Design a protein around this ligand. Structure first.
Ligand SMILES: c1cnc2[nH]ccc2n1
Length: 340
């Protein structure tokens, strides 16, 4: 019940607690599921103090409960107090994953073969997410949970959205943030993230490690070269255009010069994923059909969404009190006596 001077209260079903890190908005523990007789992961979450925190929680729960994919983390169980007044923290029980791609790349140079099947699993999972008309919006090595080389699961859907190209209109992780976001909700933003994850697996370091968003653009252009007038026009904002000028013109660094030892087929796909123009950027089904993944690509073994995703009644400007009620309602099916 007690872990490092903090209540966990996941009993009596989940026992033998162990500490495996923190983050947001509570610690993460590996417990023993006495029912399934296997060790699982448990996320303690205390979001009800701040409106933004409730959003990410409510958002992830609604989605992970409806998604069902081999490459996407699921929610096994949700521990919660009987009444709304009582509960201040929510416990989400998921499959225990040994590590993640962020911690892996900090300790290992990945082989080309391993990079390939890793990339395939990510895209296999993404294909399902995109088929449900949903954007992950925050894809990065730390959000890729790993057990073996053949066990990859996508996690953290707190920033997820339903795809809406006509909107317009909190941001994603800077390093994996698509250029169109910084210049002006499309599926292309996820493809760009995966590209950044590909480039990272090839050299064990972030390809576009900016300090702030303007520096982030300087990094992107520093490798893709100065954007053409065609690409420059698509920038709906003014500044840009008119901050490109002032621009110190640069040439497109060849991918083979940046990544010498890398597979040429891999670099070709990488070039497609990291195009400046979002409209010319490669799509998820096309990425899978690329010659780099030709030994894994199998449309018959790549499940898609049964029905496109739409939240029943949603979106920001709901106070943290209303969100808590919606969280209380969404987690109700894990409670005793749950009818309907
Ligand atoms: C750490 C270890 N395993 C996990 N499974 C789901 C989240 C998580 N975090």
């Amino acid at each position: 019940e007690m872990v490092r001077g903090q209540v966990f209260d996941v009993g009596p079903r989940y026992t033998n607690l162990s500490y495996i890190g923190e983050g947001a908005y509570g610690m993460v523990c590996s417990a023993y599921d006495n029912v399934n007789k296997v060790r699982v992961a448990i996320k303690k979450i205390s979001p009800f103090e701040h409106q933004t925190y409730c959003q990410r929680t409510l958002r992830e729960i609604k989605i992970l409960l409806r998604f069902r994919h081999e490459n996407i983390i699921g929610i096994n169980d949700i521990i919660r107090a009987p009444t709304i007044e009582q509960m201040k923290d929510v416990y989400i029980v998921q499959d225990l994953m040994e590590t993640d791609l962020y911690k892996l790349l900090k300790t290992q140079h990945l082989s080309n073969d391993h990079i390939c099947y890793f990339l395939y699993q990510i895209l296999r999972g993404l294909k399902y997410i995109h088929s449900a008309n949903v954007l992950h919006r925050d894809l990065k090595p730390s959000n890729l949970l790993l057990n073996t080389t053949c066990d990859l699961k996508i996690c953290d859907f707190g920033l997820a959205r339903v795809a809406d190209p006509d909107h317009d209109h909190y941001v994603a992780t800077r390093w994996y943030r698509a250029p169109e976001i910084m210049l002006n909700y499309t599926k292309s933003i996820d493809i760009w993230s995966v590209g950044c994850i590909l480039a990272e697996m090839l050299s064990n370091r972030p390809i576009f490690p900016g300090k702030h968003y303007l520096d982030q653009l300087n990094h992107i252009l520093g490798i893709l070269g100065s954007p053409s007038q065609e690409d420059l026009n698509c920038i709906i904002n003014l500044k840009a255009r008119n901050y490109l000028l002032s621009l110190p013109h640069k040439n497109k660094v060849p991918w083979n010069r940046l990544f010498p030892n890398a597979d040429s087929k891999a670099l070709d796909l990488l070039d497609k994923m990291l195009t400046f123009n979002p409209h010319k950027r490669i799509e998820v089904e096309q990425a899978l059909a690329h010659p780099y993944l030709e030994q894994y690509y199998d449309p018959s073994d790549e499940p898609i969404a049964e029905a496109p995703f739409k939240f029943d009644m949603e979106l920001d400007d709901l106070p943290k009190e209303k969100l808590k009620e919606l969280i209380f309602e969404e987690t109700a099916r894990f409670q005793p006596g749950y009818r309907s």
